[model samples]
Target: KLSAPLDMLKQMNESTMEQTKLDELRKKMSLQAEILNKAKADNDMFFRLLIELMSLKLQGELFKEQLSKISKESGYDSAQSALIQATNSEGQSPLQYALQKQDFSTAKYFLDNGAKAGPIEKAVFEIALDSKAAKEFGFPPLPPEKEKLHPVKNFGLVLGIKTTSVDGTPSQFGHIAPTYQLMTDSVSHFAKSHPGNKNFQEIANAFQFSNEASAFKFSTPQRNPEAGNDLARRIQGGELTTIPVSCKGHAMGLSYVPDGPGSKSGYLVYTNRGLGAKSSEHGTHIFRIEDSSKITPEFINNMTSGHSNGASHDEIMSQIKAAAGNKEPIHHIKQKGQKNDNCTIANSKSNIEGILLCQKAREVGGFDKLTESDMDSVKKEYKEFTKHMRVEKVNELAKALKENPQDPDLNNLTKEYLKQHPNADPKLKQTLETALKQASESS
Candidate 1:
């Protein structure tokens, strides 16, 4: 029975004519067609099983060879890629198949390949799985919504000082104040416009902290002299922490005279107030605590040398210039023999000398004279410089126009320029008009 049907099917499989194969196979098995159909199905199943087994064996051999090559080439440094390829040939990429089957080996291989543990990695793995699933099912994956980002806010704390001249002498006194009050007010105004943010509430706390007078205090020198020793003791004991605040050039001086048995000379407690804010070329007010009791030669040296902490006169001037927008060179001048003249006069002299020296070095000729070529170079330099200067002037004018577009001066200047240049582009003229209108509305 097996011999006759097997021969007939083999002949059909080998037959060149498709109709002849069908006719012969049907006639040979027509007596028991139902049984023959069942037998054919079983044979097909058996053939598929054999093919699968052979394919698996062949794939295993290929995987071993490929892994060996990868190991040899990379000196076993990148075994993860080899594992991924081998596992992929078996079906999915190592990591993908491992995740589906909960295989720790595949997961370890991916991790060893430098996969990090985070939301980004999770998202990546999800996308990969989705892509594979789509390929197997013959359909597209679901679309994801765009991610939303949150805005960031900055908050900082600072202490400030406002001083007044005490006694007819140029001696000044300072009051410790928190810079947070201004910041809080600014934040409150901002919060009204951006109601979604909660930063304004935090800023309000800063304002409350600043309102307490006890939160601020002057150096002992600014307080009663009779209480100097007691105040010093309090400071040393950490009962009080003084906030050194300063402004430009002048230091807020607090002096105290001790009358106790152990007390010696009248001590002056000074805080340089100009440390935090922008400074001008004229000078900077710096803030720092100067204790007479712990005074050293280095301390006196630093004071006399016009250097407080890391701040110098030049540094203060640079800071001031920066604060003033750094648009033009700052020129600070004071006549000699002025009653309230601080040591700034001497510092300015040094700065001026340094500036002149730098200018002289850059000059093509000697400081006193200029050669023809030197003059030409100077002209070229100034020409380029003036172009930048013109742009700056235009910016300033634009700002002014924005503030008062319909002002007579601005209107007249625009009219005069247009009249002088009749060939000006209509688009440019329209743009100017539009800018002026916007400025007027904003103003």
Candidate 2:
């Protein structure tokens, strides 16, 4: 019985050794699989690189051919039509198309042939100036030294001001008080004369003057100063039943002391220097009168009130159209099923119009649609645009690095681009590097 037990034990040991060997083989297979996966990933990356390089080369060749064709045919108006059609479909100007496709040769051709900067560049400046957010804080009109002011003439009429005067009393009325009647008249006269002057309207809109005679009042001292004591004595003795006075500028509050026994009434004035000379010097100058009721609450409210708080869409649109020289349409469009929504489709259509206009302008400006000459112009203009474009492009690149720190392309491209940007600060470089490292690990 002891011998048979030992033999069975030996068989059991062999079975255990076979199981161990099987486990080892399984581990080896798993390692091999992992290696294969890594190799495949590397190969895929290489393939992508090869494809990109090939695409770039093909794009270059296509651009060269197109450029040559443009140069030969650019003198013909038909060439403009063809280029315009291509741009409309591609969302890129001929120059932009070449650049995006890495067809530097084609880009250079278009630039040399005469692709002038489009009106969109000017429109951007105009929009920046006209932003409501900018107007609220008292931003001045564009400096006369840099560019001519785009007149906004009829906008004042849209804002409820009269464009012309009818009689001696004044024709157009604004939201200002009767006391500011003279100021309003002056503004209307200026608007009528200038018609669409942006600077004039900007100043006119900013004007804040009140025309009520009863908007000023005096405050009696709690401790009774000499002036208050004199007034009080006058009131008690019936020398004066009520004080007669005028407030010159804008004032918020009025105070009254019962003049029956020993009480008195007067006026106090306040001024805002920031409202400029018209308001600071003459805009809010206050005059006082003895009679408190003469300075009615309505008049007081008007004096202390702010400028017209908001404008209607029509009013704002009128201003924008005026600023834009009224060449572009300012119509509202509605969907087929929708009611009279008065939705402003001008902005959407303006971009399309701008694109068409840019293409037209290039043709008119004598651009050769395809040729070495056109390519040279493209190169020059690209360089000019790059002065500003690089800043925007680099900012985007930096943002990408933050999200993909470990991406080799992101890291290498950022490093390479930054090296070319010598003006970039050390702090910015450090920030970019930190973001790159984080993104790389995650990626």
Candidate 3:
């Protein structure tokens, strides 16, 4: 009901409205959405939708350039996003919303759709373990004061706006990455391998990102890889693609993982390098495990601290060191991913669609709120969209008839057009119908 009305407004703005009016009304609709802080709301949904849309678009050909740009921009690489706000009304993002509702089912739906997360809203992470509860899932849980912080863990920042794809899939694309993504791997590898090693793990979680300014720079004597690694060059900089990838994407987000019921989670952490000799250690990276109990208001604030007002890599580093003790392990990953037309698009679509389905659920469950007026508005706007589409189809029909009245392809296209525009103009439909009949007899 809520979006239906807003969507109707869009139908009118695009279909029936004239030039000056188009600008005026479209601006008006945008203003209304902005005023409602739809930037963060639909801000949330647009990414989810884009991720889903990408599945449809990323078929056939997969270009690394655009896909990776989308991959970076959509991931938690930044706190600012313009494209997401372009779409809607107050969209409840991921688990933070679900946290309050205690609606685990909804959270599951949210996560499926790309709802993205982690840890307590704030108490102080301490240099060591804070709670037995906090030690299990992954990180500290919000201070034992629930029914309190009320709304825990949320930064509602737009990661990136929807942009066009090279493949011509989704209209304007945003990475399903732009939306909330689960973000695992990088940390898990460390967890499985070096439970004690601390060289680069210090900057593991997604929280390490300090806005887009100086994204996590896990540098040292480490040299870039050259051969079999496909994505290594796509991300590593200095020589080629200046993307802050692999280490940045795979390893991080252990902490960012959203909490669902019994959400069993774990991530890597580190102790600073003992010093080849520096003020602070640089190689204390390692893995740690904890349950949802580990979340805290303080930890939540710490992770999202950079989301709004902003923080730099140094700031995030300092914050992490303060909590998990001084350690920093380091490593790069080489996951052999073979991309194909179908296998690749499957997960991409499924993940984002999860977000899309949850977003649509509101329309399904909440009908009590809609009014007759709202219904009328939806119908009216819908007409505006349909009529214009009808006109376009009729033009196509006219062209097709001129060239080949009896071509089976022409008849099929006309029939397809009719299905999409059920309420199309009668004159155009009949004309198309007559053409199809004439063509059949001629053939």
Candidate 4:
């Protein structure tokens, strides 16, 4: 196998052509995959052509011609060059390299060429969170809001206060509603995040948890789930959601950041509405999470120190800036009537069960923010799709039932709708169950 091929290159001379070993040899040639680890070569060779044609590198037949000859021989193959896991000094592959360069054109070529982030590449891409609105929000990703801190060490709290009511008004107020039980629970979850990762215990050591997002919603949904004044003001972040909400309040059902640097990063007791105090007070709060957050007893104090209430969102945050200068600990503010706060807090309940459903989504996925304008677009699109899910869609479905009551697609359509909006009208789910039964009987 070596004899015939070796002779052609050698010119009968074993050292017939050994150019720069890396580059110069390619000077007189076209190219071949020429793999050792990964080096693109040019010498008019099909084997090496893939190397030269980068993402969008070759848009026409010239590029396709080279790929046409890709083959595998011996125990190795050059055809898989695009996906080969050969790491360069830059720690990137051909496709990722082009993306990093912002060479969308070139990147498209690789994509068209079937460039896929394999399991490994996919992991890296996920961490990067490549997207359009990516930069619109997070600067470093998680913005921090920390004020006043001791030179070293940390002292945090579960401080919050309740409000009188939304009254359609937005104000900040709340006091310490610490759930030591939840704190321990959060620490465990945070600690168990990645058992195989390094210094994880160390990571767990830095942060604390207090706000259990679904804690209060545990009672009966009818009681507290959607209660006015009692309704939790929804705080939302890109990935956060209130996907799993209920009515019939389950008394216990209740709930739930900034960043900074000095030593490490820690999260809030409540991953969603954990605020108040600061790094100067010690540490930062990093992670604004939630969907529809109501003004809770806890949030008020979290926003308005002096643990003030009845203040508008504007005033609360305004005070946050003014008080941002307060360097002392809670005791500094806790003095006078501070420790003696007329603390009105949200009643805690069993959120552990219902909460996991939404959180799992947060951990494994993300949610996009929808502004009024976006909702407007959605409304228009909805109109076209289902007549805004009103009489039109209903009639369309009914007509479909008349044509064929057993159409499984009809059931699927309703089930999917219900899934997407679990909080949709109770009648919706009931209607779905009805549709299924009625169709089953009719069929």
lDDT for each residue of candidate 1 in 15-60, tens digit (9 for 90 to 100): 2223234335435444344444432222233223323433443343
Tens-place lDDT digits, model 3, residues 1-443:
24432442233223332224434644664566566652233344444544444444443124223333442354322222222122222122333333222322333333333322212100111101122222332443323332111110110011111111121121111111222221223222333345553211322232123122222211110122211122222112111111121110011121212112233333223222111113232222322223323333343334332221223335555555454334443221111121111111122212221222221222343334545665455444334333443454366555666578654444555555455556656887777677667666665
lDDT by residue (324-425, candidate 2, tens digit) is 234432121111211111101111111222222222323344222335555445344433322333333345556766765655455555554446544665
lDDT of 4: 0.29
Off by over 4 Å in 4: 1-86, 97-106, 126-130, 133-206, 209-443
Once model 4 is optimally superposed onto the true structure by TM-score, how far is the C-alpha of residue 404 displaced, in angstroms?
Answer: 42
How high is the lDDT of residue 215 in model 3?
24
TM-score of each: 0.17, 0.16, 0.20, 0.20
lDDT of 4 at 117: 43
Off by over 4 Å in 3: 1-178, 181-252, 256-285, 288-296, 330-443
Model 1, stretches more than 4 Å misplaced?
Answer: 1-369, 372-390, 396-437, 441-443
lDDT per model vs. reference: 0.30, 0.31, 0.29, 0.29
> What is every candidate's alpha-carbon RMSD to the true fold?
35.1, 33.0, 26.5, 25.5
How many residue pairs of model 3 clash at the backbone? 73
